[PDB]
Amino acid sequence: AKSKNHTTHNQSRKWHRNGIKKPRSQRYESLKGVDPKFLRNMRFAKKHNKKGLKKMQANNAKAVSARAEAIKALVKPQAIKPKMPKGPKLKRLAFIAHPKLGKRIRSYMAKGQRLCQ
Amino acid sequence: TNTKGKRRGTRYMFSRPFRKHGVVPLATYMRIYKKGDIVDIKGMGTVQKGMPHKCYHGKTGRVYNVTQHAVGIIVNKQVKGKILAKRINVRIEHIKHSKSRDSFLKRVKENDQKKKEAKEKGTWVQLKRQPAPPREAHFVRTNGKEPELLEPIPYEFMA
Amino acid sequence: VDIRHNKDRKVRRKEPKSQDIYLRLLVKLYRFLARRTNSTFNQVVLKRLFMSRTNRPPLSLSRMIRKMKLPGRENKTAVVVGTVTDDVRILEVPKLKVCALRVSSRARSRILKAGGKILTFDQLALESPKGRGTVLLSGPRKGREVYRHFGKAPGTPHSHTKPYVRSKGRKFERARGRRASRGYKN
């Protein structure tokens, strides 16, 4: 006859089995609900963006020329090949142990360890 | 079961604070809310129009629409194991700017300027926050004064 | 201990469900290429050879011409793991090098009459073992009728999804719930 009325037992366990997923975020969101008078203007603003394309291109070209001049005014430096460190023994031994920068020094050291030559 | 009334159990959450009733201060109407900024929702019982539902009191969201007297907010609400982004219209009196966002925007500013100062000075500066590190080693001087000897006090049955 | 096992087995195709021996020979060929070559093109082709027919939609001739006319795509081979169909709404066909599993007879005639070349995937391996100079195209995967019925339910406010309807007319699911004059319209 009589039965249980209500419970939220085991409900939180069911929810977390697949996770309480936060809503997905998109870079662009819906314009649904924002002021209709505001929508009407924004569409008119987008509609006429084609006008002034000539002014945009001329201004962008001038900036590109200016930044090209700035790049030319600067010179990219060129580094030198790393040399054998002197002081720290660990730094010197890491340089010798480097497969690329240590190849020549290792050959000289190995040629020195040769016995009965 | 209980009722589904809209203001059930809002006896204290929509009441005005003690000795703070009366006219709404006018700077609350002068706060300016743009599209994209984060606002705290806190219903005020003095104004009965545009009142947020009780489930949004204490919630924080961001402005997506601005009207003459109200603001549309995208607020996260948990519903039986799923979180959904609700859109609600709340009059200006029931919202205020959220100071957590203001603090972060300041930290971005001091970070960018510290990068510029570091590059111009040829130095390296720490920009990531770090959790409270373990206390460093230090000396504690006694100053020729012995530590005071503490001792548990006897029990006394008061009134 | 203290782990979950409901997602341990990944559900994906490791072989074609087909018994077509010719597809099985191309799978044998591109299984070798995906292993012994660092090309990610050979890996993508191998996956699509396993895939079902609904996941290999036909590619229209018009759409391939659209995608092969984009800048920098000249003198490249259009690769389709699927069928190349003819579009009668296109009247001029340029010269194209297309590799596909299947090409419809009219599409093959139009491509060959234009001066183009049709290749199979075994000739594509011999010509471009790495997949160099190719455009990997695909047909519209959600461009079939079942996807008009999927998603938010029709009787739910902002849903534009097609109901399952036996016949189309004024007397078939148009009154109550689709109209403010009959109950409601959400």
Place this chain on the structure above:
Amino acid sequence: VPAEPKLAFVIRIRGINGVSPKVRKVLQLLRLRQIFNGTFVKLNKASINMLRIVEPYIAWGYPNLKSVNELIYKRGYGKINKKRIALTDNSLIARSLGKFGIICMEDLIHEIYTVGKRFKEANNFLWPFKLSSPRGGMKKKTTHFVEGGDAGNREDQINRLIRRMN
């Protein structure tokens, strides 16, 4: 007053039956998914408050140089391509950790012990240690250490426990 320690070793001392959801979550963030699993934890206010949540479930303390040596040498395994690989040669360490400057078992021990930069990478490389049952038994698994039990922060006594489980 010496600097309060920067390194902790945490051993799960409880099973997986009837664990509260918050304690369960913190334990898998510490990678203690099994009983008598151990790991090194960098000590700061973020981690310490995490260890307070799981206090009845763990026995932790401050390892010494011998403890970090025996753990890494005797039952130290690497997480190489999502596999539990025994550290038999220094090449395994160099291939996964050599970009940070760790190329041998000595570098990894120095990295864990004198915790500094790249402790996150060196410690996460180590698979959570699978320690045996403590030889000689325990006092009381269900009670804190300062009450004659097992749980909580035994600050320097953790090395006695490591000698018996490793």
Place this chain on the structure above:
Amino acid sequence: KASGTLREYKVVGRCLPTPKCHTPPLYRMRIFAPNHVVAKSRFWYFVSQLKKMKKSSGEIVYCGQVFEKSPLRVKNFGIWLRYDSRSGTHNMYREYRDLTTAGAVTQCYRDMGARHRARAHSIQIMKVEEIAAGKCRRPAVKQFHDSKIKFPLPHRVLRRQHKPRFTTKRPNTFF
């Protein structure tokens, strides 16, 4: 807490320096604990209920064991303690004879458990000092202040049972 054979620890601590107070006072207690880990926890238990100082706002400046100065000299110890019974809390003064201060305190914990079913968590020991023979008050301790102490060992129970476990001779307990 629990017990083994307790040691004495001198634990000195203080509050962390604050802009309000750059040099907070140092506080010292004598704590009897099985190990130094329990000693520091016991220090924070007392100093928090006395001086409003919590562990999170303070630090342990020092914690070392206090060795017995005359471990080969027999002494009398007075213990001032307070303990919680099943109904009420009480103040007690007790005497013990021992060679070390820590051993006398361990005797007191055993004796409180034996005579009053008091557990260690319910006991607070507030004073332990060495008492001259003339200032002792309990007859159990005073009877050993006798320069010609002399007693036999009447009825010695055979403790080496089970060593033969089956013997022809019945044991003699006179000696």
Place this chain on the structure above:
RNA sequence: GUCUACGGCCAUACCACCCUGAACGCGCCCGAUCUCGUCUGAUCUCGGAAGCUAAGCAGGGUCGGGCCUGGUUAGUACUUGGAUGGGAGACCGCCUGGGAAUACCGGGUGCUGUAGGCUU
């Protein structure tokens, strides 16, 4: 050092009573033809400039009430987590963290924005 017009925060600004207020101002004040409104030119509206700081207003005062703020209460009350702790129970102790509120005792008693004056 101050005031006026418009304000922001809405008592550290309020309330009771006493003292002082230079110069501008703010007022009290004089009057009812016009504008306007009343039982009543009291209020409101309008036209003034003989007098006065008595009042409002400003500043100060009071072992002042209130208000604000800090000690104390108090690591007390309460409380997250723990135990094959205690107790017949009621309830209580301990471990691990957080941690209040009266009475009682001190300190303070508006800050300020825009524009325009006086202190010549």
Place this chain on the structure above:
RNA sequence: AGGAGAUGUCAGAAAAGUUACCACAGGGAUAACUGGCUUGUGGCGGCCAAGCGUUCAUAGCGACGUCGCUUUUUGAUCCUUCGAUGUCGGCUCUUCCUAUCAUUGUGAAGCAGAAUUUACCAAGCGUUGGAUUGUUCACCCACUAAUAGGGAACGUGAGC
């Protein structure tokens, strides 16, 4: 296309009863016995001591309060049993309990004797014949040492 006439069992069938002559599918998801938890109520005890007892709180009682025990009352609940645990009482017969009416041995008294009351060890032994009532219960008549109280599936229907 927009209003209105209504469904209150209010997401909205058009709807009176009886069955002891009854039927079916089921239910121990659910009542009417025992049993089990509980003991309010019933019953039986204890503590304090305001008074009663000529005098005197406690020989014997015991107000105002308060702590228990029992399951021979009645409730409360619905755990077991509805493809069935035969149901009130009496008759017959055995055993058990003691919270003892008598009898054996005692202690106390407001115990002079007689009679009586209070308490202890104690259930070995005994606790009847009848009028009225279906009765348990009750009541009366008459003997008696006394005519105590109860349990055992509210013992006991393939025993009546």
Place this chain on the structure above:
RNA sequence: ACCUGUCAAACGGUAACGCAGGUGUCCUAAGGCGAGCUCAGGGAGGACAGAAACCUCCCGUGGAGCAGAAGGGCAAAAGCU
């Protein structure tokens, strides 16, 4: 089928033939706007006048009112005219 306070363990949600209550209406204004006022109560006075008629001054943070129950809100208000 609905609403108020509480239960309900300071987000939200939360049961019982739980507790305390209300509803199937009422309003051309008690809807809307503007202006001007301040309410309950109390003290002290004034012919008949008295514990309660009306007039006047003073105090009054709302202790009144806002139609329905309750909670919230409200003072040159949302109250009265």
Place this chain on the structure above:
RNA sequence: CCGCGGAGCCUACGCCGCGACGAGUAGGAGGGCCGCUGCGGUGAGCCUUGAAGCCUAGGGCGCGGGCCCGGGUGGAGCCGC
């Protein structure tokens, strides 16, 4: 090249290596050289020198579903892929 030669492999639906893991009602899915009856192909299959069926303290295989062989009985059909 004074030797003229050098194991196995790879039913690719195959073979090999490394690491972690293994409870289960209701329920879902996969594999089955598990089993039954009939049909199309195939085994130059088996069988009166003994088919099916039945019995078995025999020899065995497979985690298991089951299966193969020995022996006895039987007398005309039966099985593998």
Place this chain on the structure above:
RNA sequence: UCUAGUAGCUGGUUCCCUCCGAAGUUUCCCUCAGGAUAGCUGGCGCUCUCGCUACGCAGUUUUAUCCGGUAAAGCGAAUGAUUAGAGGUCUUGGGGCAUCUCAACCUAUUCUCAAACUUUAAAUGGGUAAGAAGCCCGGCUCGCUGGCGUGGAGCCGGGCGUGGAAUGCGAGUGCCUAGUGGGCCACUUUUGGGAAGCAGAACUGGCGCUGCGGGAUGAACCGAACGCCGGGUUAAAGCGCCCGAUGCCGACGCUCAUCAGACCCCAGAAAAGGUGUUGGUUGAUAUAGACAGCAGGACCUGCCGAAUCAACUAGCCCUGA
């Protein structure tokens, strides 16, 4: 014969192994032994991601920043409830008799309270943020807004990687979808009831779906979760014998019961008592002489000549039983 009539109801429902694995809850229903619905499950995938010869996420913390009116506390603070004295007095007050005491009112205090009270106010909670979808420059568009070169939004170029807390982890997404929709137990919180192995809730864990070691036995307790095995070691619990393991020359005490006691849930006891014994607290006496005892006067003395008396408290044991 229609007829194998219908049944939300009872009974049954046939081979093996492998992998994954629930629900008794929400809303609607002449709905309460049933359904539809969401949730929980499985299957099929698919889109991507990292690495060798990171697209992002989280039953966690930290750092910032909001939200709240429960525990507590308060009533010489509001609303209600409420005890007792004190100091003054207008008294449409009364009584005993020029009156005087009471009552009333006021003022300053005081005792005790609130789920449907509150100035104050936790712990544990809940929300948001912790960057490349960012930051900073230059330009263009607008019919919206407008003193304005205004404002707001949009769009087009350019520059800046110290990747802007800790820890851990590979993620995202579509279709189809069975069973379930009687629950029950425990710590803590909590409503009704004297209470219940009673009825009803919150949170978490568990039993149901689950065996294993221990609690003698037992759905739920304690420990721990399971492929077939060998070695080693533990948990909870134990080690007289049943029965593996104290056959330790174990340590200190307490306790004798003519109903002794003997281990979470848990399976039986209270108020009140004891000159049983053991501790402890407070007070007091005693060299002029203690307490006893031997007697007198009637509280004092002489004789013995060093500890004693009282009240209370709490352990085991005993009465209550």
Place this chain on the structure above:
RNA sequence: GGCCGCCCCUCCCACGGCGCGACCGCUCCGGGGCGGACUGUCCCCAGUGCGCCCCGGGCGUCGUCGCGCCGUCGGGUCCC
């Protein structure tokens, strides 16, 4: 070849301690002369703080700057 092993030495750095000065900030238990308020001992009285103004003392976590002296299985591929 280098380092360590015992003796005058030698420089720098780090930590701790002890003094010496200089500079800075708070404070009065302070002194001296300039204006405001206070007291039922107010004309002959007695106090209270406030501005410039320089001397005296203290503290500053034991502030900053240096200078010395003492200690260290101290550090500088074990300084020269």
